[PDB]
Design a protein around this ligand. Sequence first.
Ligand SMILES: C[n+]1cn([C@@H]2O[C@H](COP(=O)(O)OP(=O)(O)O)[C@@H](O)[C@H]2O)c2nc(N)[nH]c(=O)c21
Ligand SMILES: C[n+]1cn([C@@H]2O[C@H](COP(=O)(O)OP(=O)(O)O)[C@@H](O)[C@H]2O)c2nc(N)[nH]c(=O)c21
Ligand SMILES: Nc1ncnc2c1ncn2[C@@H]1O[C@H](CSCC[C@H](N)C(=O)O)[C@@H](O)[C@H]1O
Ligand SMILES: Nc1ncnc2c1ncn2[C@@H]1O[C@H](CSCC[C@H](N)C(=O)O)[C@@H](O)[C@H]1O
Lengths: 291, 291
Amino acid sequence: MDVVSLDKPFMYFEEIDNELDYEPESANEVAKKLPYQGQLKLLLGELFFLSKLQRHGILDGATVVYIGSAPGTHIRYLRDHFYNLGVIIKWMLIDGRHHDPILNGLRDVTLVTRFVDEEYLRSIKKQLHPSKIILISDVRSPSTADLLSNYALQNVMISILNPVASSLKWRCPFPDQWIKDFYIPHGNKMLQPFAPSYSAEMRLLSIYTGENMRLTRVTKSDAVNYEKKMYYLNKIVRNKVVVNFDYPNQEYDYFHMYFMLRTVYCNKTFPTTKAKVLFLQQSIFRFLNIP
Amino acid sequence: MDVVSLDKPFMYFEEIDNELDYEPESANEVAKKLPYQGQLKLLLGELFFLSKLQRHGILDGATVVYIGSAPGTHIRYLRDHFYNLGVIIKWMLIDGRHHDPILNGLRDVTLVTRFVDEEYLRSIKKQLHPSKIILISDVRSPSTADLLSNYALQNVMISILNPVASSLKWRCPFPDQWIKDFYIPHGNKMLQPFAPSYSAEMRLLSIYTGENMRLTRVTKSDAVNYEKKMYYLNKIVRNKVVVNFDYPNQEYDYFHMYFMLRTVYCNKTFPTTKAKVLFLQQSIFRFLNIP
Ligand SMILES: C[n+]1cn([C@@H]2O[C@H](COP(=O)(O)OP(=O)(O)O)[C@@H](O)[C@H]2O)c2nc(N)[nH]c(=O)c21
Ligand SMILES: C[n+]1cn([C@@H]2O[C@H](COP(=O)(O)OP(=O)(O)O)[C@@H](O)[C@H]2O)c2nc(N)[nH]c(=O)c21
Ligand SMILES: Nc1ncnc2c1ncn2[C@@H]1O[C@H](CSCC[C@H](N)C(=O)O)[C@@H](O)[C@H]1O
Ligand SMILES: Nc1ncnc2c1ncn2[C@@H]1O[C@H](CSCC[C@H](N)C(=O)O)[C@@H](O)[C@H]1O
């Protein structure tokens, strides 16, 4: 068995302290071990992001515009969580694909079947006005050309919507498929527990202060680094059994999930953080029908 | 006579401490009082900007890419000034129009007759590599639609060229011709002595640290402010005779020119700042054939 003792898990990209030469043979390995693992991945990341905004007092009264939301099964859980906590939020879920029927019939959630273009963003901005917007993007076209186009759209989302915070899908193009250097918004590179086994995807979390928008250039050298740090995380770290983690499941992803869940607010008062987390996890797994 | 005593002149937009309702009748007033006033305007601004970079030690060894450079008569003066100071610089002047023949025959200056598009910027970037680039832009198409397009090109100039510093033409669209909010790079809004009488144009000066690029949103409310602050500067300030300014000419623009010129480096040693400035001004006016 692959045992180790860890203090904390890598929460952000920059914390990764090692790297590995990417082995293309990893692409043939089992990408997922849990049913609905993709909804779990998104649920934890967005719960983490949104709880932060609550902590900063910028969630209540906001309209969450989620682009690339369908099917969105896990979004029903997020909505119920903040709804039950007393936070007042409107959700606007936009995707060309259809949403899970569990999202219908809620006055606080608007479902839209539209593929967003810069022009449509303008109309929704004019229509949301004057509400504060929180953007969450998970749009999907992939080639490096598809990616750049997605990233280019995400940047236009921020410029037109002008949100107070944003969570953006972020996976750097692979060095061997480089096309050109580009810019992404500045934010924390949140790592994702339960991401596919060898995924190099993370989420870019940003909070917009002032009227400024800071970007950051991404080059091929950055692409090489992303590939090597993520490959090391996936191949090595995520395959560790954190034995000094007394918890029903000690696998790295549960250890990592624990640190995100410990930041979540609950109505119920618990005697320990461990009890709150077990509760949140049981709750999340039951909702998603994960054994 | 319109007399006043001033400590310093307004060097940057933010320093303007008052505003006036724009009077459209000002558009019919004499825009210029000196011959070649436009070359003088550009010369002082770019001398100011470039001397700053020298002060920060980022000029020597750079390639100055000037887009929208023609005719560029005043650029010959700039080139001679730094050339004679020992600073090593390559100049690349690009415009679809032809340059002043005085710019020919200098091994350190390349003249290009091309209307730049994003694609061309890419080729010149690949070709300048690996030199450090200093961008100066004075491109001209104007409607608010022409402006936005110009500004959009200037931002692509910075993203592709990735310069260490930049000077950009900046005039906010008028509030009554607003089209949409947009972003410009963050920089100092340098005011321009000898700008046309009622011009709302300034230059955006930026130095790029790290791999970050910070932008700033410009709205119609900003457009109203720009109009009112600039109108106050033009109608009131620029029409003042600074009597506590002992100098051959006491008009505001000369008082303002004095503060830019006092920052310029010379080979010759002077007993007073006043002597250096008079020298630089005499020199500049003689070069431009201004009486
Ligand atoms: C993690 N990774 C994946 N690939 C390629 O990406 C393909 C799809 O796997 P994926 O990377 O999970 O796709 P996604 O990012 O769209 O979700 C694989 O079949 C590999 O060919 C990769 N190719 C390179 N060069 N480097 C990597 O780090 C890498
Ligand atoms: C300074 N100013 C100029 N204009 C208009 O701009 C026209 C051209 O004058 P300009 O503003 O000097 O042109 P430019 O910025 O392209 O160099 C004038 O005939 C006016 O109609 C202006 N129009 C408005 N609404 N507000 C202003 O502050 C203003
Ligand atoms: N322009 C656009 N507008 C809306 N959604 C977009 C988009 N282009 C692609 N997408 C969507 O991006 C999605 C990526 S899959 C998203 C999964 C979703 N976030 C979840 O909660 O279940 C797809 O449903 C696709 O239709
Ligand atoms: N894409 C482009 N590439 C090059 N120059 C451009 C441009 N579009 C417009 N311009 C140029 O922008 C200039 C504006 S006038 C510039 C005056 C000049 N800076 C001086 O030193 O004399 C015009 O000469 C025009 O041809």
